Every structure is written in C-alpha cells, then in structure tokens.
Design a protein around this ligand. Structure first.
Ligand code: NAG
Ligand code: NAG
Ligand code: NAG
Ligand code: NAG
Ligand code: NAG
Ligand code: UND
Ligand code: UND
Ligand code: UND
Ligand code: UND
Ligand code: UND
Ligand code: UND
Ligand code: D10
Ligand code: D10
Ligand code: D10
Ligand code: DD9
Ligand code: DD9
Ligand code: DD9
Ligand code: DD9
Ligand code: OCT
Ligand code: OCT
Ligand code: HP6
Ligand code: HP6
Ligand code: HP6
Ligand code: HP6
Ligand code: HP6
Ligand code: HP6
Ligand code: HEX
Ligand code: HEX
Ligand code: HEX
Ligand code: HEX
Ligand code: HEX
Ligand code: HEX
Ligand code: HEX
Ligand code: HEX
Ligand code: HEX
Ligand code: HEX
Ligand code: HEX
Ligand code: HEX
Ligand code: HEX
Lengths: 336, 331, 341, 336, 340
C-alpha cells in the first residue's frame, strides 16, 4: 500500500526524527544548489535594489531515507509532507524582503531518490539589494549579486556548493527594459566569519549592462539642439540686443530645467555622474556665450566697432570647434 | 509548585464566560500611554498614533489563593492571555491598525490578590480625523480617539477613564504641530446602533495646533517680494512697453504658478481658505497693476505723470491696508 | 445550570451540531436578511476608479437546531470567540477588489442567538469596491457606485439574500465626505447572477454620489478667466508696442498649454471628451485668436502715401476689442446652461 | 440518515482516504479541465508592464475513490471549509508576479462531488500577471498579454492539463475597460515546458488588447495640427515685422515643445523609438524648418525683394502640400 | 544516548521543563547580554524621519535548568524548530515603528545551548526605526539616530539587560551608504524607563551620522552662484537697453524663486529656519536688490540734465564694483559660521 509505505518511511510508524541532520556526528552534508531565474526585471534606482523571481533547487543526501519496495528510482512525493523532513535553512544575506508563493496549493517540490538523494525546489520571489556605482551613469555596467548562505550551522556541519554544469539557468524569453543581462555569470565564494563561527555562503554575480538608447536620445539630443540654438544666437545682428539676450535667457533656462530633471531622476549620490558633467559643460558654454556677448556689447559701447566685430567673428568660428573637441574627448574617455 | 498556582486558577475556568455572567456589568478602566504620536497627513485625513493601551477590570474567578507568596503582583508570560476573558475593545476611527511582535508578542498581564487584571498590550492604531481647512495656515484641529466595545451591550461592558492621568505623554514634538493640553470630554460617548442596543464608548480629543513658521517662510515672503517687484515696476515709468509689460506678466504668472503648486498638495476641499484668499488677492493686485499700466498707455496713446504718481502713492497704501485687515481677521 | 454545560450542549462536543450542513437541510432554502451600516466613506479615487468604504455588515438567518428553552432571556448574547463552530453564510462582494477584517485586541464579530433560532451576526469589514465612473460631465457629474452582496458556495435554491424592509442601509450620523456629497435616497435592486454553474443569489445597493464644484471651479476656472482678461488688457493697448504684445501673447498661449497639460494629471486616460476639456480648449482658442488678430493687425498696419491702412487697422482693433468679450460671454452662457441641465 | 456520518465515511478520520496520493496512483494520469471566468479585467500598468485580473478559476478532475452510492442525488454540494482534506491540483501561474486568495466573511471556494467521481473546484483568485509589451506602434499597438496555467509538483507523465471543449474562457457581460478593449476571440495554445527536473504540463490563454485612440488621438494630435496651422499663418504675413513673423513662429515652436514634453511623460524608459515620437519629432522639425526658412528669407532681404517674395510665396504654397503628403504616408504606414 | 531521547529529556514531554517561568525564579533577575550586528544599513528617509536597519540581534542569558551531562561537547547546537518550547527574553524596540521577522526556506533563528547553561539566541530582524532629526544645519548636519532595546513583560527585578563588554555593536565590512557616512564610535548609554506600572529596563545604541556635501552643494549652490554672476553681468551692460536689463533681472528672480521652491520641497514641513534656506533667501534678496538698483538708476536718469546721467553712471559703476564684494563678504561669513 502507498499510504503504509509513506507512513513507515516518514511519520508515526517511522522513527524519523525530523530534527536531526543527516550524517550526524560525522562529515557535513553538502547541499548542491542551482537556481533558475524565471523572470528578472524591476531594477529600481532610487531604492538601489532589484526583484528576481528565482526557482531555487537543492539536493542533499539523507542516508536514513532509503527505500526498497518500489522499483522506481525517482519517487515523487506530495508537497504537503516535506515539512516533516530535515531541510537546509539557507537564507539570502541581502534579501531585503521576500516571500513564498501559495496559489491554489503550496509551490514546493519533493523528490526522494533511491540511494537517499532528496530534491527540493521551491518558488521564491526576492527583492535583492545591490550597491551600484553611478560614475558612468549613462553607460554603467552594474554587478548585482545574490548570496546564498546558511544560518543554522557552522561550516563543519553544512557546506554549500554549486552544480558543476548549468548552475544558474535562465529562461529563454527573459527580457528586460533598459538593462540587458550578460551571458557569463561568475560563481564565487563568500565564506562569512561572524562572531558565532564560520557560516557557509555561495554567491552568483550577474553582469548587467545598460542600454544607452533612451538616455542618449532624451538627455543628449535636446542638449545639442540648445547648443546649436546658442550657435545661431551668434548668427544674428549685433544691434538686436534684446533679442540676443532673450534667446540666451531661454537657452539658460532650458539647460537649467533639463539639469534639474536629470538630477531629480536619480538617487542623491554624492559624486558627479557622467551625464552631470555633460549638463554642466553645456550650461557653462551657454553662460559663457552670454558673457562674451555682454563683453562685445561693453566693448562696442565704449575702431571699437571693428574690434567688436572681429571678436564676434572669432567667437562664431571658435566655439563650434571647442564644443566638437570637448565632445570627442568626453566620448573617448567614457567609452574605454 | 511554581506554575501549579496558575494551573489551578485556570483549570475549570471557562474563558467563554464574562465575569459576573448574570450580575452587574464589568467596569473596565482604560489608560493610554502615547509612546509616539505620528505625523498627521492632510492628504488622507488621518494620522498614526502609537499607544500602550491599558485595561484593568475585576474578575472574581481569578482571586489568588491564600497560599500565594509575594505582596500583591503575580506577573505571567505574554503567552497566557489566550485563556483569560478579554474585553473586545476596538477603535471606531481606525483605518488600518496593526499589532506589534518583533521578538515576542508585546502583551503584559498583571494579576493582583483581589482578582484584578491588567493588560497593557501595545498597538499601532491609525486613526482618521476630519480636518477643518478654513483658516488653513493658522488652524487648530481637534482629532479624536474613540474606544468602544463591540460584542457586549451596556448591560455587560462599560468603559470608564482612570481617575488619575488617562493620557501619559511626555515629549512628542511633531514636525509641524504642537500639542500641550487636551480634554478627555465626551467621556460618555455611548452609541446606539439601530435595533441592537447601547454600546459603551469613550473619547479623547486632542488639540493639534499648527505652527505658521513654514508657510510664513513658504508663500508669504515670495509673494510679498513679487508684489514689491510690481511696485518698483511702477517706480521706473519709462513708457517703454518692452520693459514695463514683462514685469507685470511675470508677476501674474509667478502668482498663478505658485498658487497651483502650493494647492496641488492639500486635499480637494471645496471652500475658500486663508491661503487661497491671500493668493487670489495678491494675484488680483498684480493684475490691477497691469491694468493700471494699460490705462496709462491708452490715456497717453492731464498726463501720464499724474496717474503714475497717484498709482505709486496708492498701491502700497492699499496693499498695507489689505494686509492689516487680513491679518487682523485671520489672527 | 452551568453556563459552560449549556454552551457545550448547544454546540461543541456534547451537542451533535455539525457546523457544515446548512439549516433546513434537504428542504427550503434559508433566507439571510442583510443590512449594512456605513461607518465611513472616503478615498474616492479617480485614477483607479474605486472607493473605500468601512461597512458594518449584519445578517440574521434562522437555524432550527439552535433553539433553547431553559434560559428565560430571549436575546441571549454570546462571544465572538466561539462563533466559528456554527454554520455561517459565505456571502462575498463580487467587486470587492481587495478587503480585510479588523482584529484589534480581539476580533470584531458579534453573535446573538435569539429564542426561536434567529442568529444575528455582525462583522466589521473594510472594503475597497470598484465602480466604473462616467466622466462626461467631470466637474458636474453624478456618480453611481454600487456594492453587490452575493453567495458563492451555495445555490439560489439553497440560499436567498434579502434586504430588511425598514432601515436597510443606515448611515453614520456625522458622516461627511471630501469632494463628493452623499445623497439620501439609495436604490436596492436585485442582482441574481447566472454563471456557468447555475444561479447564484446576489443583492446590490446603489449610492448616488454628486460632486461639489467648489475646488474645481476655483482652482481650474479662475486662472483661465484671469488669463482671458489678460488677453483683453493686451487688446487695450496701442499698436506700436509690437514686441510687448507679441511677448504677452506668447506667455498667455504657453500658460494655457501648461494649464491644459496640468488638467489631466489627476484623471484617468479616458477616451472620450470630458466636460472641462471643452472649457480649456475654448480658453486656449480664445488666447490663440487674440494672438492671431494681433498678427492680422500688424499685417494690415505694415501693409503700407495713404493713412487708410492705419485707419482700418485701428477700426479692426477697436471692433475686436469690443467684440471678443461679448463672444466670451455668449460662450459662457451657452456652456453653463447646457451643462447645468 | 446522518449526513455527518456519511461525510465522515466518505472522507476524514474513519474513512481511510489518504489525501496525499494522486488518483489512479501508479497508473494513467488525470486530466484537469480548466475554465476561467474573468470577473474584472483592467489596470494595464504600462510602466511596470503588468496587469491585474480577477478570475474564477475552475477545474474538474476525476477521483475514482470518491464515488458514492448512498445519497440519491448526483451533484452533491459540499462545504468550502472541509475541502482541504482531499487531493487537490497544484497548478501555479508561471508569471503571477504575486497573487492572493479572497477571504471575506468566509473562504471563497466551491466544492461539488458528482456521483461517478467528478469533482468541481472553483476558487476566486486575484492575480497581477506580467506580460512584456511591444511599443513600436505605441498609440495603435495590439498588445498580447497571457496567463500561463502550469502545474508544479507533478511531471508530464503523471499529469495532463486541458482546456474545456466549449466556452473555455468566459467573460463577464458588463466588463468594460478604460484605454484598451478586450477582443472576443482568444487563443488557447499549449506551453509544455522542459525544465531541468522534468517535463511539466502547461496551458496558456492569450488576451488580445487593442488601444482606443480617443484620448491619445485628440490630446496628442489636435494641438499639433493647430500649431502647424499657426505656422502656416506665420508664413501668411507680408514683409510685416519681427513680431509678426518671429513672434508667431516663437509661439509655434514653444507650444510644439510643450507638446513634446507632454507626449513624453507617461511611458517606461524604453530604448527604441516609439510611434508617437516620430510624429512629434516631425512636427517639431516642421516648425523649426519654417523658422529656418523665415530666417533665410530675412537674410536674403528691389530685385532681391522680388526673389525673396517669390520664395515666400512658393513656400506658402508648397509646405502645406508636403505636410499633407507626409500625413497621408504616415497614416497609411501605421494603419496597415 | 540517542539524540531523539536526549532532546526530549532536556526539554519537552519527559523533561518537566515548564517554559513559562523565568530562570532563577523567585530570586535574582537574569542578565541578558545583547550584541547587535548591522547587516545592511541605509534607506534614510527625510520626510518620515525614519531609517531602515537590518540587524542580527543576539542575546545570551543563563538558564540553570538546561544543563546537560551526556554529550561531551560544550557548544551544543539546537533546532530553529525547537526554541518555541524554552523561555526567552521578550525585548522590543521602543521606537520600532514597524518590524517583521524573516522566513525564507526556513525560519531565521539560531539556538545554541552551552554546557553550563548559557543559551545563545540570534534572530534576524529588519527594523524601520524612527529618530527625530534636527535640520538646523541641514546640508552639514551630524545626525544621531538611536535604537532602544527593552523587554515588555517583566519588572526591573526580574530581567536585566546589559551590553557585551568587548565588541557590542559590530558592523558589516563593506557597508556603504548614499549621502550619509556612518562613523566608527558608537555610544552605548542607558535609557531605563519609568512607566506607570513599574521601573523597566532600556539599553540603547547611538549611531552618529554625518552628511556628505556633494549632491546638495553642487545641485543647489552652483546654479545659485551662476545666477548671481548672471545678475552681475546684467550690471555689466548698456544703460539704454532697458528691456534687456528688465528681462535679465526677471529671469534671475524667476530662477531663484523656482530653485528655492525646489529646494524646500525635498524636506519635511519643519517650522524653523534651515541652513540652506538662509543661503537661498540671501541669493534671492541679492537678485531682487540688483533689479531694484537698476530701477533706481533708470528713475534717476530720467528725472542739470547732464549731471543726472553722470551720477547715474557713477551709481552703476559703484554697484558693479561693490555688489560682488558684498557677496564675497557674505559668502565667507556664511561658510565660516556653518563650519564651526
Ligand atoms: C567541501 C567539499 O569538498 N565537499 C565535502 C567534503 O569535503 C566532505 O568530506 C564530504 C563528506 O560527505 O562532503 C562533501
Ligand atoms: C452613558 O450613557 C449611557 C446611556 O444612557 C448610560 O447607560 C451610561 O450609564 C452612561 N455612562 C456614563 C459613563 O456616564
Ligand atoms: C426562505 O424563503 C423561501 C421563499 O418563501 C422559503 O422557501 C423558505 O421556507 C424560507 N426559509 C426556510 C424557512 O427554509
Ligand atoms: C485523460 O485522462 C485519462 C485518464 O486515464 C488519460 O488516460 C488520458 O491520457 C488523458 N488525456 C486525454 C487523452 O484526454
Ligand atoms: C544579573 O544576574 C544576577 C543573577 O541572577 C543577579 O543577581 C543580578 O541582579 C542581575 N543583574 C543586575 C546587575 O541586576
Ligand atoms: C521663524 C521666523 C521666520 C520669519 C520670516 C523669515 C523670512 C525670510 C525670507 C525673507 C525674504
Ligand atoms: C455652480 C454655480 C456656477 C455659477 C456661475 C459661475 C460663472 C463664473 C464665470 C463668470 C464669468
Ligand atoms: C464653494 C464656494 C465658492 C464661492 C466662490 C469663491 C470665488 C473665489 C474667487 C473670487 C475671485
Ligand atoms: C457661488 C457664487 C458664485 C458667484 C460668482 C463668483 C465669480 C468669481 C469670479 C469673478 C471674476
Ligand atoms: C453668465 C451667467 C452664468 C450663470 C448661469 C446660471 C444658470 C442657472 C443655474 C441654476 C443651477
Ligand atoms: C569628490 C568631491 C566632488 C565634489 C563635486 C565636484 C563637482 C565638479 C563639477 C562642478 C560643475
Ligand atoms: C471671507 C470672504 C472671502 C471672499 C472671496 C475673496 C475676496 C478677495 C477680495 C480681494
Ligand atoms: C465619443 C467619440 C469620441 C471620438 C474622438 C474624439 C473626437 C473629438 C472631437 C473634437
Ligand atoms: C528612425 C525611425 C524610422 C521609422 C520608420 C520610418 C518613418 C518615416 C516617417 C516619414
Ligand atoms: C481690461 C482693462 C480695460 C481698461 C480700460 C480703461 C479705459 C480708460 C478710459
Ligand atoms: C457633448 C458636449 C457638447 C458641447 C458643445 C459645446 C459648444 C460650445 C459653443
Ligand atoms: C472620429 C474622430 C474624427 C476626428 C476628425 C478630425 C478632423 C480634423 C481636421
Ligand atoms: C566643502 C567646502 C566648500 C567650499 C566652497 C567655497 C566656494 C567659494 C565661492
Ligand atoms: C507667529 C508669527 C506671526 C507673524 C505675523 C506676521 C508679522 C509681519
Ligand atoms: C503689517 C501689519 C501687521 C499686523 C499684525 C497684527 C497686529 C495685531
Ligand atoms: C555609442 C553612441 C555614440 C553617439 C555619438 C553621438 C555624436
Ligand atoms: C565604440 C564607440 C566609439 C565611438 C566613437 C565616436 C567618435
Ligand atoms: C463630438 C463633440 C465635439 C464637440 C466640439 C465642440 C467645440
Ligand atoms: C562677469 C562679467 C565680466 C565682464 C568683463 C568685461 C571685460
Ligand atoms: C573662502 C572661504 C573658505 C572656507 C573654507 C572652510 C574649510
Ligand atoms: C545663525 C544665523 C546666521 C546669520 C548669518 C548672516 C550673514
Ligand atoms: C537606436 C536608437 C536610435 C536613436 C535615433 C535618434
Ligand atoms: C573623468 C573626467 C572626464 C572629464 C571630461 C571633460
Ligand atoms: C486701478 C487703479 C486706477 C487708478 C487711477 C488713478
Ligand atoms: C516702496 C516704498 C515707496 C515709497 C514712496 C514714497
Ligand atoms: C473669437 C472672436 C472673433 C472676433 C471677430 C471680430
Ligand atoms: C482615425 C484618425 C484619422 C485622423 C485623420 C487626421
Ligand atoms: C489623410 C488620409 C487618412 C487616411 C486614413 C485611412
Ligand atoms: C489608399 C488606401 C485606402 C484604403 C481604404 C480602406
Ligand atoms: C534669522 C533671521 C535671518 C535673516 C536673514 C536675512
Ligand atoms: C539699491 C539702492 C539704490 C539707492 C539709490 C539712491
Ligand atoms: C526709488 C527711489 C528714488 C528716490 C529719488 C529721490
Ligand atoms: C548689498 C549692498 C549693495 C549696495 C550697492 C550700492
Ligand atoms: C568674478 C569677479 C569679476 C569682477 C569684475 C570687475
């Protein structure tokens, strides 16, 4: 009978104390883990965290769970009984909040092999935290990690290792806005040394590059348009003082508004980002254009007309080259 | 033995029977210790208080045996209130309340010799109080805290405030308010739901006075600055349109944008408030400045000097008169 | 005798009361008379089209196997801790959109078994029901948001829901709402659902909600009126101030564009044309026409040895100056009379 | 007769019904015919790329050991508080992104055991499902959002999921949506996936969502046409003066930029170019090109006056035709 | 010596261990030496005056009725499924403002019963603590946010809390924060409460938090400096360009107003005057006084006719040579005060 077999293997008439580790008073029981990213995404910048929907699996070895009745090797079980089995108590060191999934039933899987291997796959949804470096903000390459780590035992009682092949699998249709996930995923070690002993830890690194399309368009094209607007502000008659000063005014106001929006769209980090330098240089160019026009007006008001026109002409033929060389240096430095 | 006293007390003690089942109603005294008073949100008409709610009734079935040592008090674990009858005191203003269990469920329970019990459980109640936004930047709201029973009528349960200090706050220091003295009036608040009976109710009324500082620094100074800017726009009188129109234009536009921005946060109440009155009056003064310039232009296009001198003489006086009237009325 | 013995005999171990079979089993269905007690409205959101209500649902069915005779009291009151061991109806709100109970210091249930067998049951729920709104007359609309009590586990022939004849939907005494104001008359229609599995009982109540025009009126009509008068005082100026008038027109056009953009920030992306979008469009059109007529006057004046061009430009300016305001008054009268009926 | 005794004999303590083993154990798998009932669709959040649905998921398998002959009735209705003591399917939504049951005044489950062994089961869930969206034709897109019913604990060889033959996905008659509209025809395909731990059965339903133009059409296109007409009128001024030409033009560009910011503030940070973006950029380009033409004419400006006037006339005659050609071409491209 | 028998004998059915009476009952109170470990700090909100800390609270009391003699090991390890049947202290954070446990793949509790009777106990909590902030020196403040460990069920004579002598508050190695930087010294004071129901215990830790000046400095001072220099170059222009000067002054005033409104919008609606508010007010006052002095010069130039123009030019030159000096004096005076 299947009920009698389950009862004798586990529960009342079994003698299985679901409180003692396998291989007690001996070598530690290694727990081979392998996650499966079901759906990535939701990379928030303000909260400095991302949400991942993992399909975590792990398979240890329990010697006191061997059976001999059924000829099958991989006997599948009911996710309503795996609460009466000793299980690893791995926790994510930077979970920042997480929960199970229970829809129409629990979302656990149990599979006891013939020799004693026990598969265990639950469907967790983490919102992990990863410190970011926004120095090269429009073209940054983030590295957000998860740290699988035990909590109950010392290293001598529980060791975590990844599978040799296919440790971190990725869904075929996994797509992201903005960022794009790389292919290589490092599997390092994170052995912790707390005040209460050594606790095992394994971490995986996800290299996350950022697509430059949206940022490029939205906060680069308007800047170029405003710079060209200032350039055509050079291309106007000298006598139109109110017109030129007003056009300089609207260029300055547009740059200020765009800089405020760009700085308000990101967390208030201390250092200067790669796009803040671009905004600052564009604003400085517009302000210097207004300054040089005021200088031309002062010189003309005080042979004076000839030198004012010469200054205007050298300005008109000089700022475009300076802007081009600045653009070339900026793009060559921030693309290496 | 040690716990045998409480085992003997709780054995044959049915927790589904109130004390004095067929007798007089149990008189429950209520004491509140506000550990931390939260910030009142004008957007959703609510605030978040954090209290150490305390109750104390008399249960004759829980008299301590004469063999009990210790003077009067027999404290027990927080994990034992499940076997004791408890009044079903609930808040009639709560929106989304919460318990508190960070390491163990935060409930204290004292038992005296005469059978009195003292439950001092901790809550995180989120009350709701309807604000009165007339005189908005200088108002004194009264936000309540109603405690009432649910499953027992007045014949079984009644709440009486403690004869000492029912509220025991020490330091609060709200970010934008300040409470000094409150009244525990409407002590009796018993409600009568139709076709059910009389239910006991008690009520605490606070006085959340609002500090003017931020708003006096928020709108008063910029608006006064813009009005003075319009006045100095009067002062020049160059009869140059390209230099005289933009000042009035900027004054009117700045007033409109400031009014919209500062009103985009308060709840969408429908009545004139002090802030709206001030903004409307100052915007009207700016518009009247622009109309004055327009009439100067049409009269000049008896001279414009006379009318400009009259305006420069009278607008500061009229604005000061309006300011005095406004502050006297709303203060 | 012993209250504990009485409770155990009526339900529990020594009772034989199985709290899984409906009363009048294998017989007529058990009607459940319901009557809510609206404690407080509030949070009538437009973005998500839902309103949060804190109802006080009560109901009273007839359970024959709960009769008692030893006690002389008729309205015997029990505890909200032992009502789990009795059969209860399983009404759910078909448009609840999320809800939760209230559990502070205890639960918030009530049990009151009467002498004959009537059982009162009054739990305290906090619903956030969903009601599709009609924003055609957005600042001057009247809404109708409804709740639908309905059973799920049983059949119309096994469980019927009815409202009380007198006082079916009570209202809290000092109840007030921001923006909307609640009416007095509330309809009580029927909601009998026909799912794939068959007929499930459902009963609904309708709350007629008008909208106050104070806030919308003030802070979305006064600025538009003031900007229109700004265009008028631009009209009231000489024609030599071309840069000044063109700058004022630019500012006013930008202001109406910005205000129209800020109009829709707090409303859902509804497909059809609202009530106040027409007003904003007409104000923008009036400012646009003011700038356009300035352009026409400048064209006429500069079209030029004759002064007839200047004379006709001045005539055009004067006639527009005296005509626009009348056209705006006519539009305002038409709009208000057609949208206040 | 005692219904309590009948229920206890059928299942519970004195029954021997072990509610942990699949029906027809060590034998053929059991189909779980599913048919949902969408009570309330909507909440199409574009920023987070997800939507909320309120289904009445139903399923009816066949349990041979639940056949009864005592009661004469066939469609015996049971209590939704005691169905936790039977075998139940454990299907989960592969892209649920969080979901919860509904428990108001009671559980919201239904149970119905037929005479032969058919068991109905209709719970009331509220999902917030995830569907990647394609925004190439942003205002005229045809979105395809799906729900993937899939089992978790049992293998494909131990389980088959199938949709009901007739009327599989029912829709509430009074269902309505803002923005999008739900189509009548819905696709119901298979999604049998091959995980690393075996084949799991899966069934998905496709929901086709059109987009109403009404809000977007009016509020993003009518102002653009108005500003284009304003630019044409700006062309229709004679030599006139600076404000006449410049002013009209200065407003036109300013408003079309306001239109830009407006069309921009409501979408996720997507990389590729949208459809409304093309129209908005072309409108801005037409306004800027009209301003540049006006400039060039001013730079040119009795023979030079004649050629400048001829250029102005040919512009006022040709630009509307070019705009009409572009409009027709754009609409035919995005309406096929 | 079976593990199943030994665990039951030590606690549970065949033990006689009543998990409802404190150790050393009817005697001296039991010390509970505590030592937290900041796993991940941050999320320092300004509007709600709260910060989220992810601790790893540990505590080790002495329960004499848990001693064992069978196993020769000293640091015996027990089950996170067993500690629900032993007496535990009930410390609660007096300013928790909301908290929750952590349970992923299992609970997150550690139990370690020593040979003599010491019982280690380390849970993983994620608090969102509340600390009032003094925003007088807002861009350069040194905040002090605290947590108060304190039980809830006993009296002073029943349960004593103390900090560990060496290494009481540990910090994760690679811990970093946006804006603020967490110091090294952490005060460990006493916060013993005297409520109405008796004297209760209260141990607190102080985390001194400085504020980095980068973002605030740049994004709300560089634009202000640029606009003030724009007002100065408005000075350095022709006197006849009345519309140009008026427009430039109006633009500077509008920019300062918008920047002040934006700066005020990121902080709670506090009553007193901040440190950045003084700077923004002074910049706005300078811009307004600049436009006003232009207005005065324009009035003077109109109303000896040639002498009036000469004195107007003299006033303009005095302004253009003096304003910047006054602004430099104000800048030095302001920076020397809020740095001491
Ligand atoms: C860390 C490692 O290499 N894996 C361990 C090994 O050291 C240990 O001897 C063995 C005992 O079963 O379990 C595995
Ligand atoms: C409050 O009034 C109710 C209603 O008459 C009455 O039953 C009760 O005795 C009163 N209690 C107090 C506290 O005055
Ligand atoms: C409920 O009312 C229906 C309609 O008359 C009736 O069949 C039934 O007797 C009532 N309830 C009872 C007593 O079963
Ligand atoms: C349906 O269920 C039967 C049950 O025995 C099974 O044999 C069959 O494979 C299932 N699939 C089909 C063909 O519907
Ligand atoms: C610490 O524990 C000892 C023994 O129980 C007790 O005597 C002492 O009073 C406690 N702590 C203090 C200093 O109160
Ligand atoms: C806390 C008192 C505040 C008084 C008002 C200060 C105004 C400063 C700004 C003036 C432009
Ligand atoms: C809801 C009452 C509305 C009364 C008419 C208001 C008219 C305001 C505009 C006047 C020009
Ligand atoms: C809700 C009553 C509103 C009364 C009219 C207020 C008008 C305020 C603006 C006056 C210019
Ligand atoms: C509810 C009475 C409203 C009276 C008319 C108010 C008009 C205010 C605007 C005046 C320009
Ligand atoms: C220009 C007149 C505006 C007010 C019209 C009022 C019409 C009657 C309304 C009755 C509710
Ligand atoms: C490491 C300190 C950085 C301080 C901010 C420097 C800003 C430089 C750019 C200013 C436009
Ligand atoms: C207290 C009455 C307020 C009436 C509306 C506002 C009038 C403003 C006049 C300047
Ligand atoms: C109700 C039909 C709406 C059709 C699209 C919007 C038309 C706007 C016309 C001004
Ligand atoms: C760069 C995006 C091109 C999109 C397809 C071509 C559009 C032609 C519009 C006239
Ligand atoms: C909108 C303001 C009109 C002012 C007209 C003044 C007429 C004076 C004769
Ligand atoms: C269905 C709304 C029609 C609104 C017509 C307004 C006409 C104003 C002149
Ligand atoms: C059904 C909407 C038709 C909109 C036609 C607009 C025509 C503009 C010239
Ligand atoms: C952290 C010190 C900043 C000093 C800034 C001085 C600016 C002088 C214009
Ligand atoms: C409490 C401060 C009131 C200030 C009133 C305004 C004084 C000019
Ligand atoms: C500018 C006048 C202020 C008056 C305040 C009120 C004095 C009683
Ligand atoms: C990789 C992106 C290069 C942009 C160059 C713009 C001139
Ligand atoms: C790899 C990208 C190089 C861009 C060079 C731009 C000049
Ligand atoms: C479809 C209704 C259009 C009304 C337009 C009014 C100007
Ligand atoms: C800040 C303006 C400087 C002008 C210098 C002119 C020589
Ligand atoms: C010119 C002011 C310098 C201040 C330096 C403070 C460290
Ligand atoms: C604390 C007040 C400082 C004022 C400084 C004025 C320059
Ligand atoms: C692929 C990005 C194209 C952007 C064109 C402006
Ligand atoms: C890292 C600094 C780059 C500066 C480019 C102008
Ligand atoms: C509106 C003010 C008019 C003043 C006339 C002397
Ligand atoms: C701003 C004050 C003006 C005084 C005129 C006599
Ligand atoms: C919309 C106003 C038109 C006036 C024509 C004289
Ligand atoms: C269906 C929309 C057509 C728009 C033509 C301008
Ligand atoms: C302007 C032409 C529109 C055609 C739509 C099918
Ligand atoms: C030119 C294409 C017309 C299509 C009409 C349906
Ligand atoms: C506290 C008063 C500050 C004033 C600054 C001008
Ligand atoms: C800004 C001060 C001006 C003084 C004129 C006499
Ligand atoms: C602005 C004040 C001018 C005073 C002239 C005597
Ligand atoms: C800040 C004072 C300036 C004075 C100029 C005359
Ligand atoms: C930056 C200071 C400039 C001073 C010119 C006189």
């Amino acid at each position: 009978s299947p009920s009698d077999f389950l009862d004798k293997l586990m529960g009342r008439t079994s003698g299985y104390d679901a409180r003692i580790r396998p291989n007690f008073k001996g070598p530690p029981v290694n727990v081979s883990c392998n996650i499966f990213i079901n759906s990535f995404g939701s990379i928030a910048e303000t909260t400095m965290d991302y949400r991942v929907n993992i399909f975590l699996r792990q398979q240890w070895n329990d010697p006191r769970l061997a059976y001999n009745e059924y000829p099958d090797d991989s006997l599948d079980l009911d996710p309503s009984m795996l609460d009466s089995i000793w299980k690893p108590d791995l926790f994510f060191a930077n979970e920042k909040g997480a929960h199970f999934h229970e829809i129409t039933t629990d979302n656990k899987l149990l599979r006891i092999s013939r020799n004693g291997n026990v598969l265990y796959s639950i469907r967790i949804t983490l919102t992990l935290a990863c410190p970011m470096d926004l120095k090269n903000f429009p073209m940054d390459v983030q590295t957000c990690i998860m740290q699988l780590e035990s909590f109950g035992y010392t290293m001598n009682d529980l060791i975590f290792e990844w599978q040799e092949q296919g440790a971190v699998q990725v869904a075929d249709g996994l797509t992201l806005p903005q960022f794009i996930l790389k292919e290589e995923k490092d599997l390092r070690y994170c052995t912790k040394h707390y005040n209460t002993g050594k606790f095992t830890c394994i971490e995986a690194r996800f290299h996350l590059e950022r697509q430059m399309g949206y940022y490029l368009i939205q906060m680069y094209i308007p800047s170029l348009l405003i710079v060209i607007l200032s350039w055509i502000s050079f291309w106007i008659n000298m006598d139109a003082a109110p017109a030129r000063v007003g056009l300089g005014i609207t260029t300055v106001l547009t740059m200020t508004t765009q800089s405020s929006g760009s700085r308000a769209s990101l967390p208030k980090v201390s250092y200067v980002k790669a796009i803040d330098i671009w905004m600052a240089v564009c604003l400085l160019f517009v302000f210097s254009a207004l300054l040089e026009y005021a200088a031309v007006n002062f010189v003309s008001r005080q042979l004076f007309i000839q030198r004012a026109k010469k200054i205007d002409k050298i300005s008109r033929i000089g700022f475009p080259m300076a802007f081009l060389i600045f653009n070339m240096f900026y793009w060559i430095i921030y693309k290496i | 033995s040690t716990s045998n006293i409480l085992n003997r007390l709780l054995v044959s003690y049915d927790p589904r029977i109130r004390p004095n089942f067929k007798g007089i109603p149990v008189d429950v005294v209520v004491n509140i210790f506000i550990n931390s008073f939260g910030s009142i949100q004008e957007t959703t008409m609510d605030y978040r208080v954090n209290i150490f709610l305390r109750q104390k009734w008399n249960d004759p079935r829980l008299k301590l045996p004469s063999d009990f040592r210790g003077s009067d008090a027999l404290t027990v674990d927080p994990t034992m209130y499940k076997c004791l009858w408890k009044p079903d005191l609930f808040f009639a203003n709560e929106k989304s309340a919460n318990f508190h269990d960070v390491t163990q469920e935060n409930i204290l329970l004292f038992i005296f010799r005469d059978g009195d019990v003292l439950v001092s459980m901790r809550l995180s109640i989120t009350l709701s109080c309807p604000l009165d936004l007339t005189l908005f930047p200088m108002d004194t709201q009264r936000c309540k805290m109603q405690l009432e029973s649910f499953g027992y009528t007045t014949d079984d349960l009644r709440f009486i405030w403690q004869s000492g200090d029912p509220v025991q706050l020490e330091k609060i220091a709200l970010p934008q308010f300040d409470i000094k003295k409150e009244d525990i009036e409407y002590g009796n608040c018993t409600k009568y739901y139709k076709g059910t009976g009389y239910y006991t109710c008690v009520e605490v009324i606070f006085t959340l006075r609002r500090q003017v500082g931020f708003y006096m620094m928020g709108v008063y100074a910029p608006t006064l600055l813009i009005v003075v800017l319009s006045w100095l726009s009067f002062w020049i009188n160059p009869d140059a349109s390209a230099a005289r129109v933009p000042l009035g234009i900027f004054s009117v536009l700045s007033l409109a944008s400031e009014c919209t921005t500062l009103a985009a946060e308060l709840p969408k109440v429908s009545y004139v408030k002090a802030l709206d009155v001030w903004l409307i009056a100052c915007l009207l003064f700016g518009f009247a400045s622009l109309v004055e310039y327009a009439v100067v232009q049409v009269m000049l296009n008896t001279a414009a000097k006379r009318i400009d001198l009259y305006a420069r003489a009278l607008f500061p006086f009229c604005f000061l008169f309006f300011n005095v009237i406004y502050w006297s009325i709303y203060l």
